[PDB]
Amino acid sequence: VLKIRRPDDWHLHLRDGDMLKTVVPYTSEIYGRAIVMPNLAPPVTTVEAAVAYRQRILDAVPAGHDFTPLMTCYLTDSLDPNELERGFNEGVFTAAKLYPATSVDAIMPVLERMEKIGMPLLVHGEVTHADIDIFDREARFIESVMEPLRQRLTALKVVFEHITTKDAADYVRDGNERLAATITPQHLMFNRNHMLVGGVRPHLYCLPILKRNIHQQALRELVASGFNRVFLGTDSAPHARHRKESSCGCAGCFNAPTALGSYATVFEEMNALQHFEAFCSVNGPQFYGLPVNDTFIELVREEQQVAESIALTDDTLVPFLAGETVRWSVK
Amino acid sequence: VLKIRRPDDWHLHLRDGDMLKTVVPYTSEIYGRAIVMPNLAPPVTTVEAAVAYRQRILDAVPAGHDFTPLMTCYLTDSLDPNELERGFNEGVFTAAKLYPATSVDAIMPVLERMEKIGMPLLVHGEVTHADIDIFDREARFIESVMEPLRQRLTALKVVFEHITTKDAADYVRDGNERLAATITPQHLMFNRNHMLVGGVRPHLYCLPILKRNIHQQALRELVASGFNRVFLGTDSAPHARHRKESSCGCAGCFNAPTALGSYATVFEEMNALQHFEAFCSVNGPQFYGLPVNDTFIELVREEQQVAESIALTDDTLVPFLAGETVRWSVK
Ligand SMILES: [Zn+2]
Ligand SMILES: [Zn+2]
Ligand SMILES: [Zn+2]
Ligand SMILES: [Zn+2]
């Protein structure tokens, strides 16, 4: 039996409208807080929009779930640094998120303000040029964007989100107290062979794409080492079935329902359960300057079955590890 | 306008039962002959079974289509060399096919007989061990299986089927008159980015898996060079939709309907239309010791539209390039 401080999810997608209403409870039932990514359509780029989104999230949180969404701002070339800093000072924005659609060299005033106020920058670290092989895009981001940025803004706190490579694992392990990373359950559990051998498995397709085994092993080693600037972020990224099992399936695993148990299994596999609690419930709060939760949950060794699908308004949501049997249940 | 000798398809899957009935006409309408792979359930491992399968194929060939299936034997550890040689001498088996499920070291008497009678060996050249990354399996086959085999049986004719790597392209370009290869349209047209960037595309999933761009370029260069021991083989490998767009999609592109036009486009792209006819209609017959066809077709520059699906008994067959617009039409 595993007793841990209630965890938090440092990287989550809740979407919006009815999907939001469906997926929130799976997070709010387990985690005390989550970093709520801003990539809606349209994205959350203003305080008012984040206020509104947070209330839509709260409206959707079941009664008796003690859950706080930590909001983020989608960095754009038009964002006024003053808007960002106001959201940060007012407790609206916990962090700001940089996606490849936005160029660092276009938003230097915003980044400089984040540095000055101590707001963390969350990075989806890929260079997305068509002439870069998909498996190389994360490595390429390190040398071409991440390092020069961190050299220019030396006080800036950066979370390298959902790292998937030895390149990134080494970079993070070897960097300073201002650099951290999150790791999903899928990038610990699997490598590209799992996605592509004996069939193509769209429910294991996500970005950054699963990499070769050597990379999975590097990630597993980093968590299992006790390194305390890596922490739980699921990157739970739900899409409807017709949208994962199609001629052009979307990237993202709906893993909120199973993630915690999956990380427990990985830590057990690596003979590193002593580091499981810090990963889920300590290392994140430490990097972000927030308190650790003071309620507790337990994982008990108990065969569960994962739902084959979950309903939405129309068609279905096919969870990560759908139909499969997992090892831990949340008490 | 392109006028060519009627082509042949040196690598095809026709399946069986109703699927056979649906897919044959798309081949028989265009090609004079095809190498019909033996991987049925159960596989074609006896003359009697190949006789029967060939008649099931012929039963399904529309009236006025001048099409001859060239049958192959699925090599197994239990196959009597005498059965094989009888099929070859009687015109039943044109060639025998080695899949990774069968080990070379188990069938040395059979291979030795093929060498002696001059029967070509067709190889699906991958090592399928779980501890070998999917992208490395073809390269690994060259050093661990192909080279030692060709060193042991120096008179043996071998077609390295559906080659997908520079490793294989170089190996074949640099080998002797007893070594040849086939190349699919998809491995010329695309690289792994096409399968995995901006979405996962199960209809581009096939074995051997699409490789990095450097490999696609090597293949394109080999065909465009005029090297005359590469030839058309589509590896048309149909599956039903529910089986390509599922939680675990099958490997194989149903490309019979579009392949010829797709190769024409590739050769035009590479400023190598002078080599297009030999590829489709000369180089194969030459390697196999068979006559070239003496009827002709034409490809005319004409926007066609590819069917979104094709019906079967139940559910549908989603062709390669389904719904898309292609450049050539067969006159
Ligand atoms: Zn991301
Ligand atoms: Zn994300
Ligand atoms: Zn094959
Ligand atoms: Zn094949």
In chain B, residues with a C-beta closer than 8 Å to the C-beta of A318 are 247
Peptide bond into A42 cis (omega under 30): yes
**Runs of H (alpha helix) within chain B:** 17-28, 47-59, 81-89, 108-117, 137-141, 147-152, 166-173, 185-189, 192-196, 213-225, 259-269, 276-281, 283-288
**DSSP annotation string for A3-38:** EEE---EEEE---SHHHHHHHHHHHHTT-SEEEE--
In chain B, residues with a C-beta closer than 8 Å to the C-beta of A135 are 192, 212
Number of residues assigned to chain B: 331
Non-local (6+) Cβ contacts of A183 within 8 A are: A162, A163, A219, A222, A223, A230, A232, A233
Taken in order B285, B290, B294, B297, the sign of the CA dihedral is: negative
* CB spacing of A322 vs B247 below 8 angstroms: yes
Q: Backbone dihedral region of A154: left (phi > 0), alpha (psi from -120 to 50 degrees) or beta?
A: alpha
For residues B251 and B205, the answer to whether their CB atoms sit within 8 Å is yes
Neighbouring CB atoms inside 10 A of A84's CB total 26
In chain B, residues with a C-beta closer than 8 Å to the C-beta of A137 are none
Within 13 Å and on the Cβ side, how many CA atoms surround B253?
30
CA B264 from chain centre, in angstroms, equals 17
Separation between Cα atoms, residue B175 and residue B186, nearest integer Å = 24
Burial of B65 (0-12, 13-18, 19+ CB in 10 A): middle
For residues B62 and B26, the answer to whether their CB atoms sit within 8 Å is no
Nearest to B199 among A197, A248, A318 (CB): A248
Separation between Cα atoms, residue B61 and residue B285, nearest integer Å = 22
User: What SS3 class is residue B58?
Assistant: helix
CA A210 from chain centre, in angstroms, equals 15
Gap between the terminal Cα atoms of chain A: 10
Catalytic residue among A105, A136, A235, A294: A235
Which H or E element spans position A86? Answer: helix A81-89
Non-local (6+) Cβ contacts of A121 within 8 A are: A95, A96, A98, A111, A114, A156, A157, A158, A159
Residue A324, φ and ψ in degrees, nearest 5: -95, 170
For residues A119 and A88, the answer to whether their CB atoms sit within 8 Å is yes
Which H or E element spans position A83? Answer: helix A81-89
CA distance A286 to chain B (A): 35
Non-local (6+) Cβ contacts of B190 within 8 A are: B204, B210, B216
Which bound ligand lies closest to the C-alpha atom of A13? 2
Indicate the DSSP class of residue A207. S
Nearest to A200 among B191, B205, B213 (CB): B205
For residues B47 and B197, the answer to whether their CB atoms sit within 8 Å is no
Tokens 């050539």 label which residue? B328
Whole-Å CA distances, B161 to A82, B12, B192: 62, 11, 19
Whether residue A52 lies within 8 A of chain B, CB to CB, comes out as no
For residues A167 and A138, the answer to whether their CB atoms sit within 8 Å is yes
Nearest to A200 among B130, B193, B249 (CB): B249
Gap between the terminal Cα atoms of chain B: 10
Within 13 Å and on the Cβ side, how many CA atoms surround B186?
29
Q: Which residue of B has its CA nearest to A251?
A: B199
* CB spacing of B209 vs A192 below 8 angstroms: no
User: What SS3 class is residue A256?
Assistant: coil
Peptide bond into B42 cis (omega under 30): yes
Catalytic residue among B8, B9, B167, B235: B235
Taken in order A149, A155, A156, A162, the sign of the CA dihedral is: positive
Separation between Cα atoms, residue A74 and residue A60, nearest integer Å = 22
Whether residue B273 lies within 8 A of chain A, CB to CB, comes out as no
Non-local (6+) Cβ contacts of B49 within 8 A are: none
Resolution in Å, one decimal, please: 1.9
Non-local (6+) Cβ contacts of B40 within 8 A are: B15, B16, B53
**Architecture of domain B1-331 in CATH?**
Alpha-Beta Barrel (3.20)
Taken in order B38, B44, B48, B52, the sign of the CA dihedral is: negative
Taken in order A273, A275, A281, A284, the sign of the CA dihedral is: negative
* CB spacing of B196 vs A205 below 8 angstroms: yes
Could you tell me the two tokens for B72? 């192959």
For residues B101 and B127, the answer to whether their CB atoms sit within 8 Å is no
Separation between Cα atoms, residue B220 and residue B206, nearest integer Å = 18
| Among A151, A228, A232, A153, residue whose Cα is nearest residue A186 | A232
Non-local (6+) Cβ contacts of B181 within 8 A are: B159, B160, B161, B163, B168, B169, B172, B229, B230, B231
Segments making up each domain of chain B, as ranges: 1-331
Q: Is A235 a catalytic residue?
A: yes
